Design a protein around this ligand. Sequence first.
Ligand code: NAG
Ligand code: NA
Lengths: 254, 29, 24
Amino acid sequence: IVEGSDAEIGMSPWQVMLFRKSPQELLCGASLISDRWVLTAAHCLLYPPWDKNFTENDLLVRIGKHSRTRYERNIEKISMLEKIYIHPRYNWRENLDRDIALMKLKKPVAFSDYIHPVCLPDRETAASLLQAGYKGRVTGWGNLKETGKGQPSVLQVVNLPIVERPVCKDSTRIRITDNMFCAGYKPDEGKRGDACEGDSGGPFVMKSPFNNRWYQMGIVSWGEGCDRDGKYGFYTHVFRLKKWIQKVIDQFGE
Amino acid sequence: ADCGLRPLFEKKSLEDKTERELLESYIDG
Amino acid sequence: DYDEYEEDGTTPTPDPTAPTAKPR
Ligand SMILES: *[C@@H]1O[C@H](CO)[C@@H](O)[C@H](O)[C@H]1NC(C)=O
Ligand code: NA
């Protein structure tokens, strides 16, 4: 996260860290959407151009963490994965269309002050909140700059506005799709912030004024550099893909 | 249907340091 | 407002002249 700030303890209790088992390595962010399902980006699991093709046997998650340099006794929880599910029409070869994956925990996690699921959007919330200029919130342990420090100890948080699709489209020569949206400040708005390398798979959330619940509207997916003027971060559009999400959970919930 | 309500914030009637900036964007953004 | 895809179909073969997105 670039130009963010330290999270407060328990500020993002759905935050999940995805690790490679061996060698142990933090790969990606992720989010807790029930006591046994974790949402992340497909490219965190499958990206052939980088020779990446992880199965559930290769990975684990850590849940409830705030600071990644000390074990947080009686707070953090560690879980293996029973199965992973990648969107069947995920497009790694060009534009990361449908960059979404689900991971089933090997055993359900108990909720606590530090571990609690985020909501997925319903039709009402998506229609009401997914508007240009409305702000959401991105969290992660990724790079503090595009290019001494580099990686933060404590979870980073930044609030960023959703951007109009024509501005997103004009900002990049990549062919973008309706399954992604972009967010970030415009060059004339005099504020900054972005996700960056290592934040992918983490959540873009919004707080509903209608019921005071936090909803996950996006997944950190890609960008061109980080926090550049006239560039924006791109996020998987969670609600667009919710029928696939529900199909996997409904069919494989056991 | 407990989702999205944080034990250390919404359930305590406590706001975090920057969530008001999000709420304000529904009026100004 | 929901993504639709055919059960059988495939992701499009990328235009070799088109730039590709780099994941974060
Ligand atoms: C990825 O690996 C799994 C097992 O490790 C294999 O079944 C699958 O065919 C592989 N897919 C790709 C695209 O490499
Ligand atoms: Na920018």
